[PDB]
Amino acid sequence: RWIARTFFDGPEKNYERTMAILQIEAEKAELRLKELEVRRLMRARGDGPWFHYPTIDKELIDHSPKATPDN
Amino acid sequence: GWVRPDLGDLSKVTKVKTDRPLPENPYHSRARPEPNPEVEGDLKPARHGSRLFFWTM
C-alpha cells in the first residue's frame, strides 16, 4: 500500500505519455515522406529553388546602335 | 553659293522626321518565355527541429 504513492504512478503518467510522444512521430515520419516526394522527384520542372542552376546574366548586354547595321 | 563646313559636319547626332512606321515587334521576338513562380510565405522555424535521424532539437 505504501510503495506506489511513495515512489511512482500507474495509468495516469505512463499512459498519455505514450499518447504524447506518439504525436511527435506523425509529424516526423510523414515529413520524411515528403523529402522523397519532392527532392528526388522534383524533377524536370525545377520550380522550387533546389535544382536552380545559373545560366547567364542578361544585365551585361548592350543596346547601342553599334557601328555595323547588319550584325 | 555653298558653305565651307569646317568642323560642324560629321558630328552632332540629329533627329530627322517621322516618315514610315517604326518597326515595333522586331525581327522575330518569339517569346520571353514564362518564368517560374516564387515563394514569399512566412519564415517560421523548423517544425520539430532538423529531423535527421533521432535529433530532437
Swiss-Prot record, chain A:
Role this protein plays: Accessory subunit of the mitochondrial membrane respiratory chain NADH dehydrogenase (Complex I), that is believed not to be involved in catalysis. Complex I functions in the transfer of electrons from NADH to the respiratory chain. The immediate electron acceptor for the enzyme is believed to be ubiquinone.
Location relative to the cell: Mitochondrion inner membrane
Question: What protein name is recorded for this chain?
Answer: NADH dehydrogenase [ubiquinone] 1 beta subcomplex subunit 5, mitochondrial
What is the superkingdom listed in this entry's lineage?
A: Eukaryota
* Annotated family: Belongs to the complex I NDUFB5 subunit family.
Q: How does it assemble?
A: Complex I is composed of 45 different subunits.
The disulfides recorded in the entry are: none
Tell me the part of the parent protein that is shown: 119 to 189 of 189
From Swiss-Prot, chain B:
- Origin organism is Bos taurus (Bovine)
What's written under domain?
Contains four C-X9-C motifs that are predicted to form a helix-coil-helix structure, permitting the formation of intramolecular disulfide bonds.
Query: What are the boundaries of the region Disordered?
Result: 18-44
Q: Where is the composition biased (Basic and acidic residues)?
A: 31-44
Q: Where in the cell is it found?
A: Mitochondrion inner membrane; Mitochondrion intermembrane space; Mitochondrion
Name used for this protein in its record: NADH dehydrogenase [ubiquinone] 1 alpha subcomplex subunit 8
Q: How does it assemble?
A: Complex I is composed of 45 different subunits.
Which family is this sequence assigned to?
Belongs to the complex I NDUFA8 subunit family.
What role is this protein assigned? Answer: Accessory subunit of the mitochondrial membrane respiratory chain NADH dehydrogenase (Complex I), that is believed not to be involved in catalysis. Complex I functions in the transfer of electrons from NADH to the respiratory chain. The immediate electron acceptor for the enzyme is believed to be ubiquinone.
